[PDB]
Amino acid sequence: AQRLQTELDVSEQVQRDFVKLSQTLQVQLERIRQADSLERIRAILN
């Protein structure tokens, strides 16, 4: 129906929110894995 389409849109909008969110978390984890000391690390977690 008309609503099934709008339902899909909302669905895919949230889906993309969490894709983006996961991309950020993974980049942050990666920077942590490259971190040399607890200094840099706590800096990244900020």
Binding site: V10, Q13, V14, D17, F18, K20, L21
Partner: protein
């Protein structure tokens, strides 16, 4: 004795869930907090006297699109805080629906807390304290007005959850 558990914050967007958590966990308050995307996670260990209590805290994005996901955060939670803006009657009714949902979906044993946040903004209070108190008493909900801005009753409500937790 170590007792850690899972707690979830629920409520309409922009009522102060994250702020509230930032307060409790990192003791901060950002005036221009940006809307949460999806959800945020933080932990915090607080001792009652003899036993250590670890808070596993899920601060959910409140906007309506994320509604259907909420279970993936509160399922298997032993505590919840439903938050609303005392200067917003619509955010108080929305808060009522979160309570009904938890009562239907979540464990019957879950400790639910109701937060009337932004008490510091009583300059434009749109939700009478006594009406919020009453609503709470009937649903057996730990109610408490709070201010993430001033830290009023922030630590208490968390602390009050831990004690009421079986």
């Amino acid at each position: 004795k170590i007792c850690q558990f899972k707690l979830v914050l629920l409520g309409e967007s922009a009522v102060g869930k994250s702020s509230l958590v930032l307060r409790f966990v990192k003791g901060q308050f950002h005036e221009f907090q940006e809307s949460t995307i999806g959800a945020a996670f933080l932990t915090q260990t607080v001792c009652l006297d003899d036993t250590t209590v670890k808070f596993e805290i899920w601060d959910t994005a409140g906007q309506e699109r994320y509604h259907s996901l909420a279970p993936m955060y509160y399922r298997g939670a032993q505590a919840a805080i439903v938050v609303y803006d005392i200067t917003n009657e619509e955010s108080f009714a929305r808060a009522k629906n979160w309570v009904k949902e938890l009562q239907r979906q979540a464990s019957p044993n879950i400790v639910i807390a109701l937060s009337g946040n932004k008490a510091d903004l009583a300059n434009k209070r749109a939700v009478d304290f006594q009406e919020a108190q009453s609503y709470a008493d009937d649903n057996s909900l730990l109610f408490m007005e709070t201010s993430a801005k001033t830290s009023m009753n922030v630590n208490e409500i968390f602390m009050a959850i831990a004690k009421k937790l079986p």
